[PDB]
Design a protein around this ligand. Sequence first.
Ligand code: OLC
Ligand code: OLC
Ligand code: OLC
Ligand code: GLC
Length: 470
Amino acid sequence: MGTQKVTPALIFAITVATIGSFQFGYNTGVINAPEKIIKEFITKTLTDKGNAPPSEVLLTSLWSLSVAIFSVGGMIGSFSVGLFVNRFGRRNSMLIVNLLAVTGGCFMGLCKVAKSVEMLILGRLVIGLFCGLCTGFVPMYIGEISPTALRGAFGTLNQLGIVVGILVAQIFGLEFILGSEELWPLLLGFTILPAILQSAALPFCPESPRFLLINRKEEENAKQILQRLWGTQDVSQDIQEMKDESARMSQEKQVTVLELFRVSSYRQPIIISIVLQLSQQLSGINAVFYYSTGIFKDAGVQEPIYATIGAGVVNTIFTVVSLFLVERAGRRTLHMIGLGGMAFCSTLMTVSLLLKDNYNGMSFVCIGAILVFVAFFEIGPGPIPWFIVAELFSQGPRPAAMAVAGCSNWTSNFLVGLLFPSAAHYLGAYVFIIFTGFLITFLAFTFFKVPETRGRTFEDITRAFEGQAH
Ligand SMILES: CCCCCCCC/C=C/CCCCCCCC(=O)OC[C@H](O)CO
Ligand SMILES: CCCCCCCC/C=C\CCCCCCCC(=O)OC[C@H](O)CO
Ligand SMILES: CCCCCCCC/C=C\CCCCCCCC(=O)OC[C@H](O)CO
Ligand SMILES: OC[C@H]1O[C@H](O)[C@H](O)[C@@H](O)[C@@H]1O
């Protein structure tokens, strides 16, 4: 660190940014607990308007739309990240898009009194747009304001906000909290509250000093930001690194999404970036999490909701473990340990489910395998893919790269949700071997192809890719 310090100003800026992370986690998790209540809302709304009651097929299809349109919004929003952050700045983009959060939140909060299934769906779409933007904005901002020596640790706070968001959503989802037939619209509308808090705090957060110096050529203002954030007058090493990046950006053509795949020095890190997002989603994490309640039930958990909240707690604990290890073990090591551990547990899910009707003891192995799967997920594959894309690129290509990588993350999530039910229908317990196959494939990819980013400047990493390309 040298004379660099973790100041209250720095902790403030990072924590305020991760309110967006919290929003992504909350909106991801919140819809699941009130599924039956929301289906009753859809039924009653259709018949209140005079229609025939929907079949189970239509209810399932409208429920699935309500859930999945969030991912569609996220695909669009994440892909749009580059547009916003280069035009408005990183801090200013986070401020502006809270208009989407409050709007989507109000649509969801008002859909019941408006007796409108359309408003629920529109609300989920709009909050999806917002969350997709957040998943790119937050690790970018944190990556650009963090001291290099702590960039991974601070990057992991993005995922910590996400898993805290999921857990709070699960806890609120309880029937005696906000998950009642009465108040479920408030469960959804809750997302307006972190938006108001974040929006009030964001003006007092600095704009990215990298955006200021490199994109806007405001060296003096950037230097003063760093000096305050890092609690030291001496920031020459970092300013000169940014000036090197400014020279680079001035010497490279304006970056487009398509160019990322055409240029060898860009194609290596964008393929790494995309494959790392795939390793996160094609792990099956959201399928395992969503369907955990039913799997727990089938293995004999009498009160499955408590096991799923237990998973949410494990989810949080091991994100904190990752936080404390990622600068020591490095990104490569934690990502590989997580992928390998998940491959073991997903295989054990298949084996235990195949055996449990003959050997009941294997029921408990199944329950344990899901919990340990989540633990290994958060050791690396949860936190690292979101922030590592910021690390793999210099200032110029970073927004387009995070747009592409973030979109690939949301899109692969969408595909898992779309295809998993059919795959499970044909393969039964063997469906989890599909995730095992991906996990192993990406474990091999990570070992051979993913560079260690810990403690390295963006310019260091970029020069290394150019050297490999040459
Ligand atoms: C202007 C007044 C505003 C209205 C008042 C509303 C406050 C009540 C709702 C709070 C949402 C809770 C926000 C939770 C955000 C947590 C961020 C996070 O999870 O941080 C992870 C890690 O700590 C990163 O440092
Ligand atoms: C009504 C009787 C109770 C039965 C139900 C109790 C289970 C509720 C808690 C957690 C479920 C997991 C949700 C939190 C994690 C979300 C994982 C996820 O990926 O959710 C996406 C899914 O498509 C959704 O949108
Ligand atoms: C009707 C039978 C067809 C099957 C069901 C209909 C299709 C569902 C499609 C996608 C669901 C994806 C769930 C969306 C919520 C997950 C949000 C999330 O946490 O991830 C976002 C992104 O992946 C960053 O990680
Ligand atoms: O903790 C689970 C969450 O981890 C990561 O943030 C994923 O991007 C998200 O899809 C998942 O729901």
